[PDB]
């Protein structure tokens, strides 16, 4: 109702960001290092972040906005019931300068701290997903629904190694996507982006996605999507989520996410709002 | 030109294996288990194989045939000089089975033990990947090279964590990836697929493929397409590439496979021709 304008205006925004994406895909980049050297960060992404912003101020001046590039330029993140843009100009950097397929842009929209709508366009496939709260999850116009798995022994599992290349994390991943295995699942899959992978959960073909490191912007756009196609939001500790405590565990069902969760050893992390 | 009148052919075979998949997906599926737990067979991947054998002997009765179903059900693998059909009717039976996006039918045709041609059909993406010797590599069309990237420090590359629930294997296949995340790399991707992994790196998408455990059904149809991209096969260890050995590293170039043979433990395999 009053949001539904802001929505529609996110999709032709998310879709002018993708045409950006596109057309530097076809171009030489110069890519930067951010928190280690496999977090990456080019001109695009600061270029798509400044044009979405922008174009959210000009239109409602007096919502909030909390952007991944904006962040990484010294903007203190203040998390309140406002009416809170969580953008993420290109969601899988490291797959665009590589030019891997899969590539998107996150929009959240948040009220009351709760997901109003969200928005991930995965640019290089066209495939437009879309969540609002009561309203459906769509992808081109198809609805979404999870998969009806709840035994973790047939659960197919998405996740990513993080770009994090401390010893003691790497080690922690790693050793949680062991546990995993051994329990056994059906398999891992990464497509090397946190909205995608959760998209991939809400459309059926994941069960469930986990992930400790990621940030409010990966899964602001997503989270929505995940939850309308019928699907949780987890801690991963088993808790109520967190949008600013740097973890998931997006599924099909409380049950399977209630199972990762057992098999989850914490990554200690700088919540979002610290 | 002989061997192209076999090449339009197994394009025609892969788009009618590709409409049977995606039939079998709108429906409910018998799982059963081969090997271990997480290497699953359903009816489809008997069916497609049954239709893919049946049509190649009544058009070419004087040829060859390897197939990843006829193998299980006890045919024994005599690799010749003859003009040979190697099939995997569906590579990636667990996204298969969970929707996930990236199944493909793999057909490789080799010639005095030399892979002539290649076909690998993303049919759920409708991503028709083709390589045949001295003529190219192409995907929908679009001619295929492989990247650039000779630095393994800005290198992307894919893998799977493999079928076998076994803690020796599954803990040299976790300490192989620690080992290249460590160097550092930019980071690993798995869509679930041999065939398309390997057909990821023949796009650039990915800078190189490497893997244990799978076997010449899932890498003769790829591996023509990474070769015609410019790309190089080689063993796991750094030495010549061979069909048979269950082991691969399909990369960009000589200097990337080379520094990847570096960190790879060798898991112990039986022979696809022993
Ligand atoms: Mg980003
Ligand atoms: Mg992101
Ligand atoms: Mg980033
Ligand atoms: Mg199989
Ligand atoms: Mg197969
Ligand atoms: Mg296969």
Same mark, same amino acid.
């Given at each position: 109702?009053?949001?539904?304008?802001?929505?529609?205006?996110?999709?032709?925004?998310?879709?002018?960001?993708?045409?950006?994406?596109?057309?530097?895909?076809?171009?030489?980049?110069?890519?930067?290092?951010?928190?280690?050297?496999?977090?990456?960060?080019?001109?695009?992404?600061?270029?798509?972040?400044?044009?979405?912003?922008? *174009?959210?101020? %000009? &239109?409602?001046?007096?919502?909030?906005?909390? +952007?991944?590039? /904006? =962040?990484?330029?010294?903007?203190?993140?203040?998390?309140?019931?406002?009416?809170?843009?969580?953008?993420?100009?290109?969601?899988?950097?490291?797959?665009?300068?590589?030019?891997?397929?899969?590539?998107?842009?996150?929009?959240?929209?948040?009220?009351?701290?709760?997901?109003?709508?969200?928005?991930?366009?995965?640019?290089?496939?066209?495939?437009?997903?879309?969540?609002?709260?009561?309203?459906?999850?769509?992808?081109?116009?198809?609805?979404?629904?999870?998969?009806?798995?709840?035994?973790?022994?047939?659960?197919?599992?998405?996740?990513?190694?993080?770009?994090?290349?401390?010893?003691?994390?790497?080690?922690?991943?790693? *050793?949680?996507? %062991? &546990?995993?295995?051994?329990?056994?699942?059906? +398999?891992?899959? /990464? =497509?090397?982006?946190?909205?995608?992978?959760?998209?991939?959960?809400?459309?059926?073909?994941?069960?469930?996605?986990?992930?400790?490191?990621?940030?409010?912007?990966?899964?602001?756009?997503?989270?929505?999507?995940?939850?309308?196609?019928?699907?949780?939001?987890?801690?991963?500790?088993?808790?109520?989520?967190?949008?600013?405590?740097?973890?998931?565990?997006?599924?099909?069902?409380?049950?399977?996410?209630?199972?990762?969760?057992?098999?989850?050893?914490?990554?200690?992390?700088?919540?979002?709002?610290?």
């Amino acid at each position: 109702d009053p949001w539904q304008e802001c929505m529609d205006y996110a999709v032709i925004l998310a879709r002018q960001a993708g045409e950006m994406i596109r057309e530097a895909l076809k171009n030489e980049m110069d890519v930067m290092i951010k928190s280690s050297p496999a977090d990456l960060v080019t001109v695009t992404d600061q270029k798509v972040e400044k044009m979405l912003m922008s *174009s959210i101020k %000009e &239109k409602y001046p007096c919502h909030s906005f909390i +952007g991944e590039e /904006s =962040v990484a330029a010294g903007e203190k993140t203040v998390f309140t019931e406002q009416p809170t843009w969580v953008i993420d100009p290109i969601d899988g950097t490291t797959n665009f300068v590589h030019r891997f397929p899969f590539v998107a842009v996150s929009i959240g929209f948040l009220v009351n701290k709760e997901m109003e709508f969200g928005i991930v366009y995965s640019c290089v496939e066209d495939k437009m997903y879309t969540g609002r709260k009561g309203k459906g999850a769509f992808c081109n116009g198809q609805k979404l629904q999870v998969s009806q798995q709840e035994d973790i022994t047939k659960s197919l599992l998405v996740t990513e190694l993080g770009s994090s290349r401390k010893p003691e994390t790497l080690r922690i991943v790693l *050793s949680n996507m %062991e &546990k995993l295995c051994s329990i056994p699942i059906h +398999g891992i899959r /990464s =497509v090397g982006t946190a909205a995608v992978n959760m998209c991939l959960v809400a459309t059926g073909g994941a069960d469930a996605y986990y992930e400790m490191g990621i940030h409010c912007w990966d899964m602001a756009g997503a989270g929505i999507i995940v939850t309308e196609a019928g699907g949780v939001l987890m801690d991963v500790t088993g808790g109520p989520f967190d949008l600013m405590s740097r973890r998931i565990i997006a599924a099909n069902s409380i049950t399977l996410a209630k199972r990762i969760a057992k098999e989850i050893e914490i990554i200690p992390l700088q919540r979002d709002d610290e």
